[PDB]
Amino acid sequence: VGRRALIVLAHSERTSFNYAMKEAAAAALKKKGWEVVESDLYAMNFNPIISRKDITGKLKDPANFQYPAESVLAYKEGHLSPDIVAEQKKLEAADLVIFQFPLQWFGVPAILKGWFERVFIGEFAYTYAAMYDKGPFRSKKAVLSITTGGSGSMYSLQGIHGDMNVILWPIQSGILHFCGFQVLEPQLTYSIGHTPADARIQILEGWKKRLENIWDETPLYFAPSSLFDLNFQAGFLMKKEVQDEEKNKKFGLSVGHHLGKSIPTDNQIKARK
Amino acid sequence: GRRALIVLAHSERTSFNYAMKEAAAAALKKKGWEVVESDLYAMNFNPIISRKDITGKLKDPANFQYPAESVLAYKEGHLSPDIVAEQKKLEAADLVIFQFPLQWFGVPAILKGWFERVFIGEFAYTYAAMYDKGPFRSKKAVLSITTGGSGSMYSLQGIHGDMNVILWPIQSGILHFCGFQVLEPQLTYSIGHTPADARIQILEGWKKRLENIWDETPLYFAPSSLFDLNFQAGFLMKKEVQDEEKNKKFGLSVGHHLGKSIPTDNQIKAR
Ligand SMILES: Cc1cc2nc3c(=O)[nH]c(=O)nc-3n(C[C@H](O)[C@H](O)[C@H](O)COP(=O)(O)OP(=O)(O)OC[C@H]3O[C@@H](n4cnc5c(N)ncnc54)[C@H](O)[C@@H]3O)c2cc1C
Numbered sequence: 001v002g003r004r005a006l007i008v009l010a011h012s013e014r015t016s017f018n019y020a021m022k023e024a025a026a027a028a029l030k031k032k033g034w035e036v037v038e039s040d041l042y043a044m045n046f047n048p049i050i051s052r053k054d055i056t057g058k059l060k061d062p063a064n065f066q067y068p069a070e071s072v073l074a075y076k077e078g079h080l081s082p083d084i085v086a087e088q089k090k091l092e093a094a095d096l097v098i099f100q101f102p103l104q105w106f107g108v109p110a111i112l113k114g115w116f117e118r119v120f121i122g123e124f125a126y127t128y129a130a131m132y133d134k135g136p137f138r139s140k141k142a143v144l145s146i147t148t149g150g151s152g153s154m155y156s157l158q159g160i161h162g163d164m165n166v167i168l169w170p171i172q173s174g175i176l177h178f179c180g181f182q183v184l185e186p187q188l189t190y191s192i193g194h195t196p197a198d199a200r201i202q203i204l205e206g207w208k209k210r211l212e213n214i215w216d217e218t219p220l221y222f223a224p225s226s227l228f229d230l231n232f233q234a235g236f237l238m239k240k241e242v243q244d245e246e247k248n249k250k251f252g253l254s255v256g257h258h259l260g261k262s263i264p265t266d267n268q269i270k271a272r273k
Numbered sequence: 274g275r276r277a278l279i280v281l282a283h284s285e286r287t288s289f290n291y292a293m294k295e296a297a298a299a300a301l302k303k304k305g306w307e308v309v310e311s312d313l314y315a316m317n318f319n320p321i322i323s324r325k326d327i328t329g330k331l332k333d334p335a336n337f338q339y340p341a342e343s344v345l346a347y348k349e350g351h352l353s354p355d356i357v358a359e360q361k362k363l364e365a366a367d368l369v370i371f372q373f374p375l376q377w378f379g380v381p382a383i384l385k386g387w388f389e390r391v392f393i394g395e396f397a398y399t400y401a402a403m404y405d406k407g408p409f410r411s412k413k414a415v416l417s418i419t420t421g422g423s424g425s426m427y428s429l430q431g432i433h434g435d436m437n438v439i440l441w442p443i444q445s446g447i448l449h450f451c452g453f454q455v456l457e458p459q460l461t462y463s464i465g466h467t468p469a470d471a472r473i474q475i476l477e478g479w480k481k482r483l484e485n486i487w488d489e490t491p492l493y494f495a496p497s498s499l500f501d502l503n504f505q506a507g508f509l510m511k512k513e514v515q516d517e518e519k520n521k522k523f524g525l526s527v528g529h530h531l532g533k534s535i536p537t538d539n540q541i542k543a544r
């Protein structure tokens with residue numbers, strides 16, 4: 001209507017299905033009146049390696065250089081490398097962030113991992129006070145759009161590779177939700193190399209159709225921070241009263257908070273209402 | 274005489290990560306190992322897959338596909354020499370140690386890229402040879418990780434959730450997939466609030482562990498023989514195995530939880 005979307009893409013080839021999914025998303029969103037900004041990491045020749053050069057001003061302690069402390073000072077005093085700042089401005093402006101990439105070694109591409117490492121600086125994107133649902137990006141929504149070479153069966157409960165819910169957890173909880181994002185159901189496109197042409201087209205069409213109402217979707221469930229004692233003396237442990245309330249239940253809260261029990265089915269793949 | 278490769282992913286020589294690497298090299302050399310290093314930052318290693326990785330002629334430059342093109346390049350021998358040099362270190366090594374700080378619940382970008390550029394099809398995996406049948410089944414690997422946050426935060430009840438789940442994609446997805454026997458990870462929690470004298474004890478503990486590292490029992494992964502390894506069956510668990518497991522209360526592993534309880538410390542302690 002009058003909302004902003006960022007699309008981060010991590011694929012080198014304009015001939016790729018990844019690129020086509022990005023184009024389809026931009027088209028669909030623009031048609032419904034969104035403003036669309038892109039970060040095409042390979043086209044930008046984005047530098048994915050954290051280093052001293054990310055700080056253009058004066059180091060606090062060059063003799064014992066610590067990237068987390070030094071990057072936070074640089075953020076506050078405003079001497080971060082301009083390539084980092086430009087990306088941060090896109091994020092600040094955006095209501096919806098889409099990440100489009102191929103699954104590579106059960107994770108994000110190195111160039112995208114580096115983007116997180118260089119852009120998601122302390123204070124900007126997280127603090128130890130404002131974690132998870134209290135994080136800075138709690139007004140924003142994010143969604144992963146992933147393609148894989150292997151088939152869906154391989155990432156089922158009984159598949160050789162094991163449950164896809166577990167693979168996504170470090171990314172969706174550890175990076176996105178940790179900073180505050182409401183995380184939407186991931187778009188998973190399995191065995192894209194061995195999918196026939198007419199099927200690929202349906203997939204694109206289905207993606208575009210989904211994006212028309214993306215904003216009204218229910219997000220994935222993570223344990224609220226209010227279930228925990230958020231201080232160093234308690235060790236950031238789940239509150240005793242919450243532990244007692246959960247003693248009898250058969251399922252845990254999430255993939256990461258399985259509590260030694262069964263994982264709620266598709267905790268990281270499907271929302272519940 | 275056995276060979277060990279140490280991969281390090283930290284930019285600073287003043288870091289505890291660097292110290293752990295030095296300690297490992299010293300301990301291993303003293304017991305008569307040969308030690309090779311890949312200090313990724315010191316090497317200015319390039320972590321981004323691209324066309325430039327193939328020095329010869331592309332099969333199809335109009336529709337470039339890194340997996341197909343890198344495999345041809347491996348077989349015909351026109352991979353970029355920086356890749357080949359690393360591959361030779363791996364082929365030679367019996368034991369591979371990965372030393373890095375946990376960054377966004379994973380490996381640093383530079384190390385992720387090393388996997389992406391070096392673990393090429395045919396060299397490191399095939400399709401026939403996956404998991405326990407993989408090319409590196411003669412070799413052993415171990416992760417040595419530091420974190421800023423405390424152990425309690427990565428317990429079952431901690432804010433961040435179970436560490437076993439965080440390690441799974443790396444230990445199963447990357448290492449075991451290529452054949453490695455994966456040893457108990459060395460986990461150094463809350464390194465930022467640990468004083469100098471304590472850090473030295475930790476180093477001493479690490480060195481002590483390494484004297485007998487080879488004789489350790491590895492972590493448990495589901496054997497590939499539990500699965501139908503072909504495209505028509507969809508790489509699913511065999512029906513006979515499914516039926517045998519129906520009544521058990523625990524699953525096999527973190528990834529193979531089967532909707533049941535995860536065996537405690539599946540990714541942190543051996544049986
Ligand atoms: C380092 C590395 C690690 C990997 N690790 C994993 C892993 O852990 N798990 C896994 O499952 N896979 C893995 N893979 C495989 C990888 O995830 C796939 O190659 C990737 O998802 C394929 O997507 P693509 O966009 O590259 O496809 P492409 O191969 O470029 O595209 C697929 C097909 O779509 C066609 N196409 C392109 N545009 C369009 C369009 N507009 N309309 C219709 N058709 C179109 C193409 O011509 C082609 O036929 C890995 C690959 C690499 C390089």
Ligand SMILES: Cc1cc2nc3c(=O)[nH]c(=O)nc-3n(C[C@H](O)[C@H](O)[C@H](O)COP(=O)(O)OP(=O)(O)OC[C@H]3O[C@@H](n4cnc5c(N)ncnc54)[C@H](O)[C@@H]3O)c2cc1C
Pocket residue numbers: 050064065066067068117118283285287288289290291292374375376377378379418419420421422464465468469470472473476
């Ligand atoms: C981008 C990014 C993302 C991160 N994400 C996460 C995350 O998701 N989760 C998480 O838990 N953490 C995270 N961290 C934190 C990070 O993992 C820790 O800061 C790291 O584990 C610190 O270890 P180090 O080797 O860098 O030590 P340093 O702090 O660099 O060094 C420790 C001290 O030991 C001293 N020293 C050197 N040699 C010796 C010796 N022989 N004996 C005694 N002292 C010695 C040094 O001089 C120094 O003062 C992240 C950090 C970054 C930069």
